[PDB]
Amino acid sequence: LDHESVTQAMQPKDTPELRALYKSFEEESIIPLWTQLGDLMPIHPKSKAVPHVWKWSTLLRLARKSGELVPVGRGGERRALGLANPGLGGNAYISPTMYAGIQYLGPRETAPEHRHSQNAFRFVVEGEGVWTVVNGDPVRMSRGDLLLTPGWCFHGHMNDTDQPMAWIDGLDIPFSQQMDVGFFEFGSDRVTDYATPNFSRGERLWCHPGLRPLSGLQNTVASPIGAYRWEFTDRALTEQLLLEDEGQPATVAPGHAAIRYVNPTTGGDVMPTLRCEFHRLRAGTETATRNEVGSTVFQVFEGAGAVVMNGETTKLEKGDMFVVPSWVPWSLQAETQFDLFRFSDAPIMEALSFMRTKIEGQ
Amino acid sequence: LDHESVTQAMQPKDTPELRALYKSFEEESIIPLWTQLGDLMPIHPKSKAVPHVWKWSTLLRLARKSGELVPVGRGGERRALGLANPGLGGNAYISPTMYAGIQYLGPRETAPEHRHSQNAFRFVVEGEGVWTVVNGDPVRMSRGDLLLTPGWCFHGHMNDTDQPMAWIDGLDIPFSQQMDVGFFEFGSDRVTDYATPNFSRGERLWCHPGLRPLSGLQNTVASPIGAYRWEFTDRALTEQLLLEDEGQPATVAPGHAAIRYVNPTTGGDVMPTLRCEFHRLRAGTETATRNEVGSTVFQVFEGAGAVVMNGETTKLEKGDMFVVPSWVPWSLQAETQFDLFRFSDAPIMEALSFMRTKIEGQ
Amino acid sequence: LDHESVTQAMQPKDTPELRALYKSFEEESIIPLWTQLGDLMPIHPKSKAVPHVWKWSTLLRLARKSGELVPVGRGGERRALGLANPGLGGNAYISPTMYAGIQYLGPRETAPEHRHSQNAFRFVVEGEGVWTVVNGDPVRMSRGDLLLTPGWCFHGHMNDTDQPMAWIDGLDIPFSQQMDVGFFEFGSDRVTDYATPNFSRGERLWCHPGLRPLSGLQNTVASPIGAYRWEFTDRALTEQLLLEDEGQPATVAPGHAAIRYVNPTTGGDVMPTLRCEFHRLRAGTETATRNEVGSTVFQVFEGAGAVVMNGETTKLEKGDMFVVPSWVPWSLQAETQFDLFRFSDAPIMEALSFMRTKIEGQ
Amino acid sequence: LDHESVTQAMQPKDTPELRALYKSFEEESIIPLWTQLGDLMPIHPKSKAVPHVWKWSTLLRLARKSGELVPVGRGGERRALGLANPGLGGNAYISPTMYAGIQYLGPRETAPEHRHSQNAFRFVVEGEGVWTVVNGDPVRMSRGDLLLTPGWCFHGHMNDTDQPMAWIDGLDIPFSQQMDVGFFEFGSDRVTDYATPNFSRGERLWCHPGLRPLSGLQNTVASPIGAYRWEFTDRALTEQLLLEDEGQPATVAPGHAAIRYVNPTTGGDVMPTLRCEFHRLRAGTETATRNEVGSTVFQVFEGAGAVVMNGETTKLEKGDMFVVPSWVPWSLQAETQFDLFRFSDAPIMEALSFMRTKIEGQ
Numbered sequence A, B, C, D: 001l002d003h004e005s006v007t008q009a010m011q012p013k014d015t016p017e018l019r020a021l022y023k024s025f026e027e028e029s030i031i032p033l034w035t036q037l038g039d040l041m042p043i044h045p046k047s048k049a050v051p052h053v054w055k056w057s058t059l060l061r062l063a064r065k066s067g068e069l070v071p072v073g074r075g076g077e078r079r080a081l082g083l084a085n086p087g088l089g090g091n092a093y094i095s096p097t098m099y100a101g102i103q104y105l106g107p108r109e110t111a112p113e114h115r116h117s118q119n120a121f122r123f124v125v126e127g128e129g130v131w132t133v134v135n136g137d138p139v140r141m142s143r144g145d146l147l148l149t150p151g152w153c154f155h156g157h158m159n160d161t162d163q164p165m166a167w168i169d170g171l172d173i174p175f176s177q178q179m180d181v182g183f184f185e186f187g188s189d190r191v192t193d194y195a196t197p198n199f200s201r202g203e204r205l206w207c208h209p210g211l212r213p214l215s216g217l218q219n220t221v222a223s224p225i226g227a228y229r230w231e232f233t234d235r236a237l238t239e240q241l242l243l244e245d246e247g248q249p250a251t252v253a254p255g256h257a258a259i260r261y262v263n264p265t266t267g268g269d270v271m272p273t274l275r276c277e278f279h280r281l282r283a284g285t286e287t288a289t290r291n292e293v294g295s296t297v298f299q300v301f302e303g304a305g306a307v308v309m310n311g312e313t314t315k316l317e318k319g320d321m322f323v324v325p326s327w328v329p330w331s332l333q334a335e336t337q338f339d340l341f342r343f344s345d346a347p348i349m350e351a352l353s354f355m356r357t358k359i360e361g362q
């Protein structure tokens, strides 16, 4: 049974006294339950957000043009283009939980030192030689690099070359706004440290596999790894595929290599509200259909193939971004070898025990 | 500095080419960051919900009248009156995270066996001899009793007497709706077990202080205590006040006794999304002003006194309910001995490391 | 295969040069592996301690006589009689991990305020009106009461009546000695607070089922419950048996009711090194045979029946105590209703992932 | 005050009746507390084990000679030379908790596939081209490499060259024997997989910094990293020293670089009972004196310098090994740059809340 076909027993006699009680409800800020239980409590998630794809060539065109018409600054903070879900009523929200944005930084430009409670990351698909300084620690950016900017950490963005750089912001702005959890402070209009060191202190303490500095024995809520570089991400994915060739367990599913970016102090997610993963599918691979609670977003990093969402196949190229709202059945099909970057609100669904998963063949 | 007075550097020249790019934004579901950073990222939480009080005598009048005009049933599920925040745009939400409701159950009436992912509790200020059956386990209800109804547990409500009963629902419906996390199923139109045992199985395994059944060694995400009875709550609060008389640490603050309802398997909160507490202030007590992230709601259980919210003192009687949205400075003043029941979304703010606290004298 | 029948390939030619190398080993503090792998690394635990029973009437006789011949004091600290395992080479160790002792306190006598790192508890089978003061907090003692005395907490013992009292100490002295973990300090020769309050502060904050004081929100490594009283222990066990009569899950095994004493801040064990449980078997009940890693000890609190250890049935009366060393197969058989108190080193085996369990019918 | 000078009040009158009660004690396996509280409960740890150094050139000489006189085999399992503490009564125990051993494996020799509950690691100071197969996964060994062999994992050792190899075993045999926690099984006399792959599967899934395979989302009690290679260990230590040159936090103490080997699924220790660290001191560095609960052991990997234990300076060269029993004050002084490998029983002291630390300048 469901909400579209269950017997509605309460439906009250439309008398003067009834309408007067309803007038009374309006006055006293009361809304009766009966007239809407179903809206409030669906059979399964039925998101206001809608599955949607953004074409990279489109995003690029509008990003370059923004580069012409407007400087990056101080009220607006970033020349960034936020992907707004058609189903979310004009809000700059790619899902109810996440903001997803393309930030363009033109030659020699800078962004200034700020912090907010909202958790953030920067993912670079094309570009080079911009540097984000986090809590004073300059973190070089380049193709394939995930940089983190966990909540309440100072950060600003200096471009060291005559080249523009395009990256994606991901944040829990939509969660943080709706739940009243936001704080924000100012730092400097120049980035705090103009130095351009090829690797960051955080990297240099923390990017040694299976090793922990004795000066860093305390666990952290977010990750101290300022950058997860393309190289390591690439090699991990390749080994998983080589291991598969060799008949050893590694891949998540046949032909489907994948890793999660993690906080090394805990082995858990990079930040309290956001999970990041990277996936490499072999040419020909088609993932089982999944329904998962919460929203995820992917960007095609390399290769060619397709998503299916609610049964609708959309063809996908390098750079394209799509969102799968809560519970929408989704799968991915690689034409060539298909490299994809992923973020979701899953750590929220998981901390609060709201997660569920339906997979096709089980 | 803040968002009302920082220099806005980006403000682009209003040319034809600019307006064309903006037209282009609308078409492609893009919203640029610059025109609204401040809305998105405030200096501190600035909730859409508003501090509000509901007068019990008012809620009672409208609840009784609902008892006349409408039966409790099957589409509408409950004859319950939801406290809607004036600041939340018509939604039946007392805060962005919580639903708060007054449910009236008339003589001999029943509610039927359902379950949903949404977490729930039932708190009885006046009434007797209704019974909620949880996963088949009948749980008697009476003045002062917190009953839990954790997510995904079957539940229905049979009234064993010619008396009406009034209680409050509290749920994370507003969280669960906005985050797309809701599921819902049907059970029976009679409650599953008409038996009326004076205490429930859960109570009888789990309400022995400092003792755990060896058949219940596994930890749970929600509490197995079906009911936290007035008696124990009352005695705890009294002892804390006696201990204070005796010069021993106990009270949270001078004259301010208080306890948190807990999951005994973990010592943590009753449910993943909701904290419940009970407070007893001595006559004359005035709490330090607090700002806390997330929303809380209180109901005056006994006595007389006042709240101050944003500096506005409101006088309060037995049964009244008020909400303090995220970050609104609040304090409480007891005229007589002031007993109050409390719920909040704090376990969410805390799991996700979003919590902060400003207290007056420190 | 095993160590008694595997081929020994290394066995070196007994030449002058070999004996010279062995002489050399002795000199340099070297012991070669080859000559003893099997001693060092058995097929399954093969404890030096031996299953043993102590007859209460025996312990009582020797305790009273100790009462005549010797006062309780200041070097010797306690007039206590420690159960020494025949297999543990003269040490006052009931198992390799635990000390088990019967302490006699005669009329009007006191013990003085000390503390040590070693974790301790006091369990009273017969007696009344002695009081242990813990960190200044007087904790009354009587038949059935478990008192805790966690490591590094000051404690002393005043007897308020013309009656002697007999209880059992349990401690991790044998663990703490062998692992070099012991510290010890002095407090007073009178107990710190001669007052005799019928319940202790700790009880009065913490013994309210499912409730936590807001002044005690921090988790603890040991339990803040100073006393787990007979009443609650008794009622818990009875309810589990009533629930069984009623066809509801409760008992661990058919006719076998049981509870674990717990730290309410965590739901975990009372102390880092020691687990305490209480068991009530129905007349006729015979438990499945178990092998568990680590040692346990039981005292018959009420009733009559038997243990089987390595196949040897021993008949048991009120007060008797037996130990089951690591991995010895054991079971219990109730003739009448059989009440038993239990402690083990299981939290150690469990924290370090050394635990295993073999049960007969599975 | 202490146990050498506190008043001994109990000392009973030596009468016939007293001696008869004592005779009675012996018969009934009772040992009275009074006559020995102080032995049992010292003021601070006073270990039976003694600070001791083993000279590498000595260990090497006896290891080579063992290579002549005896083959590695099947009863004796390993041609390994265990460092026995003079203070531990003939047992092959370097401390009460740990076994420390030097294993010699001659040309073309193998060890066979076994497993035991006891946790183990292999650390190579000099040697190359031996391979330990763990649960079928061949793990190459070379200078500076820590290999893990967590409890209950099959393992055997094949030497692929005409060269001998010398390494150290470290195990919790002494803990496991004394606490009755040991199990042991047989596998094959050839290692299971003669293949010699330059890196192991475990490495290849798990040695990518800040990355986790989605096929390995479950946490583990021991580490899945089969090998922590010299390279990464070396670079980590160097960066910490470069960071210090650059005025950035990194080192534990001035001139004192250091890392802990960790389980990447948790950020915690490599195994439940054993901590491993590596330290690199700058020439001239002298560490503050420490007292720590539990025993540690170090091996000088490179450089030259000294330890001080109970005030006794001993000079130290490449390969030397020393043990610091529980609570012995210790410090380290580098003459040249001083590289050292370290293991301890600290995870035990820490899980059970027995740890304490006294440091000189605080």
Ligand SMILES: O=C(O)c1cc(O)ccc1O
Residues within 6 Å of the ligand: A078, A080, A101, A103, A120, A155, A169, A171, B033
């Ligand atoms: O700092 C950033 O790059 C940033 C970018 C956004 O699109 C939104 C919020 C931010 O703080």
Ligand SMILES: O=C(O)c1cc(O)ccc1O
Residues within 6 Å of the ligand: A033, B078, B080, B101, B103, B120, B155, B169, B171
């Ligand atoms: O079952 C209830 O009593 C209930 C009451 C509400 O006001 C909202 C949702 C519910 O499930």
Ligand SMILES: O=C(O)c1cc(O)ccc1O
Residues within 6 Å of the ligand: C078, C080, C101, C103, C120, C155, C169, C171, D033
């Ligand atoms: O304080 C006690 O009652 C005690 C009794 C013992 O048998 C051994 C150590 C102790 O500290």
Ligand SMILES: O=C(O)c1cc(O)ccc1O
Residues within 6 Å of the ligand: C033, D078, D080, D101, D103, D120, D155, D169, D171
């Ligand atoms: O497998 C080994 O290399 C080993 C070595 C030892 O010295 C002691 C126990 C072992 O299992």
